[PDB]
Design a protein around this ligand. Structure first.
Ligand SMILES: [Mg+2]
Ligand SMILES: [Mg+2]
Ligand SMILES: [Mg+2]
Ligand SMILES: [Mg+2]
Ligand SMILES: [Mg+2]
Ligand SMILES: [Mg+2]
Ligand SMILES: [Mg+2]
Ligand SMILES: [Mg+2]
Ligand SMILES: [Mg+2]
Ligand SMILES: [Mg+2]
Ligand SMILES: [Mg+2]
Ligand SMILES: [Mg+2]
Ligand SMILES: [Mg+2]
Ligand SMILES: [Mg+2]
Ligand SMILES: [Mg+2]
Ligand SMILES: [Mg+2]
Ligand SMILES: [Mg+2]
Ligand SMILES: [Mg+2]
Ligand SMILES: [Mg+2]
Ligand SMILES: [Mg+2]
Lengths: 208, 68, 294, 169, 157
RNA sequence: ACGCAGUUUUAUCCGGUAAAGCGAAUGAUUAGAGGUCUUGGGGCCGAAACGAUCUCAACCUAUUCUCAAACUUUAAAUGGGUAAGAAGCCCGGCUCGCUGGCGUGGAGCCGGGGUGGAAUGCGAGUGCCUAGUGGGCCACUUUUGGUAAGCAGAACUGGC
RNA sequence: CCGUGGAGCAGAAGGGCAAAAGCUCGCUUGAUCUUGAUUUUCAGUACGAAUACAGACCGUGAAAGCGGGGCCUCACGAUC
RNA sequence: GUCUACGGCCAUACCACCCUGAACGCGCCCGAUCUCGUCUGAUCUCGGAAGCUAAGCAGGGUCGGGCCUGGUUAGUACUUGGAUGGGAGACCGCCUGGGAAUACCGGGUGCUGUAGGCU
């Protein structure tokens, strides 16, 4: 296991798992929701999300260790089914290794210069959200402390932001309680459906 | 003994040392490369222009000199 | 619950063509029929479009431009009562007759009347129109049978034979006229003249008058209810071809105007559409207010 | 009160799928010739089974399409064999129904012992005047919504004509 | 070492873009390609018989020879040495006109009409195409409403 | 006046990178919801029974998370080609064995008419003979392999 | 019945193709002879490949036209 | 105000459903003796015209799906040229110029040439 001191900020084109690679091992992370997966929208009002600052690459093993630390702090703080954490970031960039000493100068040189797939990292833009935790109104500081414990573990500099939106949807929490009741937004599981006015009349007849 | 393989560095400057030239001068364009049926038209048309153009063009020149 | 029928199919649907979705063109034969070779730059390629429809057939000669197809001349089957042939408007005789009318009308429009008589006496041979030196040459035209399958006996070839006997130089073969035997390669001209004059359907009228008069009164009703007898048909088409070749001038109709119309239902405006929507909203609110209580 | 929108027999399919080629398939074609008076047409590959021994391009089946009064007569003989008792799932969603018979000499044909005991698939489609649009070469247009034949229309046709029983079980 | 064969970089360039796959239109054929006509080159994917080369795509040439169902165009191609006038045989489907020469002929016709009017009425016309002039000392209007004060907004994430 | 430009302007085409998207095709990929066709595994009414019920598996519909140098609806900046006239525009007439309803079309030839036809800068075109050269390197920017290199290899420009 | 290419086009991929360049059927060798021009690599040399022509003899088609090998991108060779 | 035949633009003109069609025309329809090719006159051809606008077709409609166009996104992501600008790097800011797209919202849905016929 080579350190993250050598696999670093983006210097090559994205090389994903596809028909052309066919040699990547399995990634470290497999799941992405840890809290109440079947949580309704009105259950957990607010959310805090972890904003990046450096154009870096985050590894899947770092994502594993960070989601384990955040899950452990959430189940110590607010217990089971009192939070919902989602890792927004998904690993697709496959790094390459050029290993040697398979201890003398007599194995190869720089003859075969193309490498073998070692692991999977994820390219992170500036301002891209790493993780997002939705909880109650009184659990404002616990989300901050959990994302701080993830901040001590991710490399580089990144900040925290408690969102103006209502959880994972793209709609504002200030207009949410006013606008889900009258006309438009209907709860669909953990997501929210937005109806336009460009529908057939049978949808409006089935509603109201 | 590995050497440098291929480059186009320091090439546009050598191109513009002497001022890359348009052909820039073709009056009465060349005629080779054109349809042989069209050439069987045009050569017979030119030699009968050389033969039978005298009297009608002469009377037309006299008529336009009289009318202008 | 089963199929994933239409999600982005409408968004990635490439429409074929207006006339192809109507089912009137193919364009794989039109790209070769229409387009003139570029050594001429202006010379129109004259095409005799022969379209067979129910109750009428159409025979035209047209060419093409980039704006649209310019029609040089046209002829229809429904004017044959005005040109002599009262009944039988979609037969092989009407095809030959419409081709002869179209050829005589085109040569009358071009003024090539006295020369290029063509074939006056209908014989059914392979009469090919030749060009006369010192005179304007023959009219070079090419066929358009359209989407119809060109089997031997199709009356698009009868319209072709009418155009050729009228004097339109169209290159053609004799192995698709009716009367050409499939096994024996020899062509029969007497059968083709018989099929121009329409004596086989005269034999079928004799067959109906001998076998079963019930079908003879069921079909062929306009024939027997004005007048049709086979000797008068054999004289009637022979008089009709001469009556067309003596007067192809196509006297038209005046058609000034009749300023009376209410047929097409016009569109409705944006405000009218939105107020239909608003009345539907108000009526459903009235339904939810009234019928849920009552 | 219905202008010329009448359900009628469009065609009638006759199919015999023999598990081998040669003698039995040729005698099945001879049976279809004894029914119709017209020659059948054979079938072929796009599958090789290997479980009972048929191969590519072998004459697996014979079939024949009958139209008109002969189709109505063979339909009458088939419903006389079944004694007018179909089931609910015979009628397709497009308004077409098949039933099939065993013991093909029940139609009224003198059996020869050299031929063999076969059976024959009967499949009926329904038609209205105006179904030549989708089959003609020039303007292949759509059928329509109010004109197409449905499940309920087909089963009410079979209730009205021939006095059949549905047997919805 | 890039295997310099015919059309080794034409995954997109000789492709019909979107909602245009099918038969070719006939107005592409029904054009007037006479001699001396300044034309353009744009390769087609449907007709694989007369596409010029990947190097002549998007270029502009002059017609020297016209045949039955193609055309011959002279094109200035740049190579390592110097630009050269080269003789190409391209079919009709790959070629459209160039409207720049048509716009120049329209300008020449308008200048000839203005020169005829000048010779008629004795009026100088200034028919040269002057470029975009500097703005004259024009006059603004601020009646009714005061000029709206703009200030930069605070930073909110 | 003739003409030219590592340049700009006015018109006219060309592309498929940066970006963006995949509730749009192809390839991947996360999670929840609704519906009930199908088969498989449990529990219930009880001889058994698609006679009936609950859950799960797969399927469909509307969503939702994250991407793709060898994906793309869209699509920049930069850039490439062309035209900016006396070699051009119009009129009249001959020739053609090319073409052909046509003195139709197209080419060539002959005679005549009017030059003030975007900016800026510069005096241009052409022929012969020939040395040296064919080991390169560095830097801003765009990038390939490598963990990285004063590493190896490319593009423009500048320098040694 | 739905079915815009999700199949097929000899084979590695890319482009392209629906009364089609895909499948089936009927005739046929234009996969023939000959002289120039052009593109590709390029030094504007050659080879291989290809294009538009021209002149004969032809094949198919009702004619239009199409065809001098494979729908295109390679599948091949100087002096003596 | 329309249709028929041939079209040019190639979804503003396709797909699903519901209404309307008076006059020509377009068609569904009625039958195989000749021309015709099929297992079947289902398809293609032969002489029709007893009914019909049920269907195609032509118009209108769907707070319709798609398509085109216009705001929003957005002077944002990008990008030519510059600095002895910042930062350890990652990258970021500025001067000079050019300037994109999805969600979101709003509007439309055929225009025409030739030839011919009906009000
Ligand atoms: Mg070297
Ligand atoms: Mg054809
Ligand atoms: Mg590229
Ligand atoms: Mg990108
Ligand atoms: Mg020397
Ligand atoms: Mg040396
Ligand atoms: Mg180096
Ligand atoms: Mg070195
Ligand atoms: Mg120096
Ligand atoms: Mg279909
Ligand atoms: Mg392929
Ligand atoms: Mg030849
Ligand atoms: Mg028969
Ligand atoms: Mg026969
Ligand atoms: Mg019939
Ligand atoms: Mg109706
Ligand atoms: Mg109808
Ligand atoms: Mg409509
Ligand atoms: Mg819509
Ligand atoms: Mg910059």
């Amino acid at each position: 296991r080579r350190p993250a001191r050598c696999y670093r900020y983006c210097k090559n084109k994205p090389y994903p798992k596809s028909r052309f690679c066919r040699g990547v091992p399995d990634a470290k992370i497999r799941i992405f929701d840890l809290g109440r997966k079947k949580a309704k929208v009105d259950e957990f009002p607010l959310c805090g999300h972890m904003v990046s600052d450096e154009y870096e690459q985050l590894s899947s093993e770092a994502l594993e260790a960070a989601r384990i630390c955040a899950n452990k702090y959430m189940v110590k703080s607010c217990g089971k089914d009192g939070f919902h954490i989602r890792v927004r970031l998904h690993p697709f960039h496959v790094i390459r290794i050029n290993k040697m000493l398979s201890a003398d100068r007599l194995q190869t040189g720089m003859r075969g210069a193309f490498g073998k797939p070692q692991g999977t990292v994820a390219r992170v833009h500036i301002g891209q959200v790493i993780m997002s935790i939705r909880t109650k109104l009184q659990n404002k500081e616990h989300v901050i402390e959990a994302l701080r414990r993830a901040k001590f573990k991710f490399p580089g500099r990144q900040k925290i932001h408690i969102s103006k939106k209502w959880g994972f949807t793209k709609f504002n929490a200030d207009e949410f309680e006013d606008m889900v009741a009258e006309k438009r937004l209907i709860p669909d599981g953990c997501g929210v459906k937005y109806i336009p006015n460009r529908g057939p009349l049978d949808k409006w007849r089935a509603l109201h | 003994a590995k050497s440098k393989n291929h480059t186009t560095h320091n090439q546009s400057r050598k191109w513009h040392r002497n001022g890359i030239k348009k052909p820039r001068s073709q009056r009465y364009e060349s005629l080779k490369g054109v349809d042989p049926k069209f050439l069987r038209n045009m050569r017979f048309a030119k030699k009968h222009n050389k033969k039978g153009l005298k009297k009608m063009q002469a009377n037309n020149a006299k008529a336009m000199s009289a009318r202008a | 619950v089963k199929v994933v029928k239409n999600k982005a199919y409408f968004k990635r649907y490439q429409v074929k063509f207006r006339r192809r979705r109507e089912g009137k063109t193919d364009y794989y034969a039109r790209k070769r029929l229409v387009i003139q070779d570029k050594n001429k730059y202006n010379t129109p390629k004259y095409r005799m479009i022969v379209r067979v429809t129910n109750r009428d057939i159409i025979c035209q000669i047209a060419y093409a431009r980039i704006e649209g197809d310019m029609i040089v001349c046209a002829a229809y089957a429904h004017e044959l009562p005005k040109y002599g042939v009262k009944v039988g408007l979609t037969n092989y005789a009407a095809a030959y007759c419409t081709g002869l009318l179209l050829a005589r009308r085109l040569l009358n429009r071009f003024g090539m009347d006295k020369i290029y008589e063509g074939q006056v006496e209908v014989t059914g041979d392979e009469y090919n129109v030749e060009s006369i030196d010192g005179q304007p040459g023959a009219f070079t035209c090419y066929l358009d049978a359209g989407l119809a399958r060109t089997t031997t006996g199709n009356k698009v070839f009868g319209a072709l034979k009418g155009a050729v006997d009228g004097g339109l130089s169209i290159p053609h073969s004799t192995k698709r006229f009716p009367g050409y035997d499939s096994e024996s390669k020899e062509f029969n001209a007497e059968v083709h003249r018989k099929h121009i004059m329409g004596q086989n359907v005269a034999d079928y009228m004799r067959y109906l008058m001998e076998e079963d008069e019930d079908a003879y009164k069921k079909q062929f009703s306009q024939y027997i209810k004005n007048s049709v007898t086979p000797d008068m048909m054999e004289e009637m088409y022979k008089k009709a071809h001469a009556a067309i070749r003596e007067n192809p001038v196509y006297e038209k109709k005046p058609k000034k105007e009749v300023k009376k119309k209410r047929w097409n239902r016009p569109k409705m405006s944006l405000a009218q559409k939105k107020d239909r929507v608003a009345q539907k909203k108000a009526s459903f609110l009235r339904a939810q207010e009234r019928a849920a209580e009552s | 009160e219905n202008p010329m929108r009448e359900l009628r027999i469009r065609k009638l399919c006759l199919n015999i799928c023999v598990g081998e080629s040669g003698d039995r398939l040729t005698r099945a074609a001879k049976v279809l010739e004894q029914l119709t008076g017209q020659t059948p047409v054979f079938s072929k590959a796009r599958y090789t089974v290997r479980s009972f021994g048929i191969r590519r391009n072998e004459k697996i089946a014979v079939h024949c399409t009958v139209r008109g009064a002969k189709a109505e007569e063979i339909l009458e003989k088939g419903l006389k064999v079944r004694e007018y008792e179909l089931r609910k799932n015979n009628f397709s969603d497009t308004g077409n129904f098949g039933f099939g018979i065993q013991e093909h000499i029940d139609l009224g044909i003198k059996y020869d012992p050299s031929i063999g005991i076969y059976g024959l698939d009967f499949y009926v489609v329904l038609g209205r005047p105006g179904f030549s649009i989708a089959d003609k070469k020039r303007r292949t247009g759509c059928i329509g919504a109010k004109h197409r034949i449905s499940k309920e229309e087909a089963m009410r046709w079979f209730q009205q004509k021939y006095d059949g029983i549905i047997l919805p079980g | 070492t890039n295997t310099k064969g015919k059309r080794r970089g034409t995954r997109y360039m000789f492709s019909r873009p979107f909602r245009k796959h099918g038969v070719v239109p006939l107005a592409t054929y029904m054009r007037i390609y006479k001699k001396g006509d300044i034309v353009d080159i744009k390769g087609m994917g449907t007709v694989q018989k007369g596409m010029p080369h990947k190097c002549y795509h998007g270029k502009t040439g002059r017609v020297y020879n016209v045949t039955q169902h193609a055309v011959g165009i002279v094109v200035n191609k740049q190579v390592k040495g110097k630009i050269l006038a080269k003789r190409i045989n391209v079919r009709i489907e790959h070629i459209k006109h160039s409207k720049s020469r048509d716009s120049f002929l329209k300008r020449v016709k308008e200048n000839d009409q203005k020169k005829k009017e000048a010779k008629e009425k004795g009026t100088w016309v200034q028919l040269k195409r002057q470029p975009a002039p500097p703005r004259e000392a024009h006059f603004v209007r601020t009646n009714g409403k005061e000029p709206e004060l703009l200030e930069p907004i605070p930073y909110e994430f």
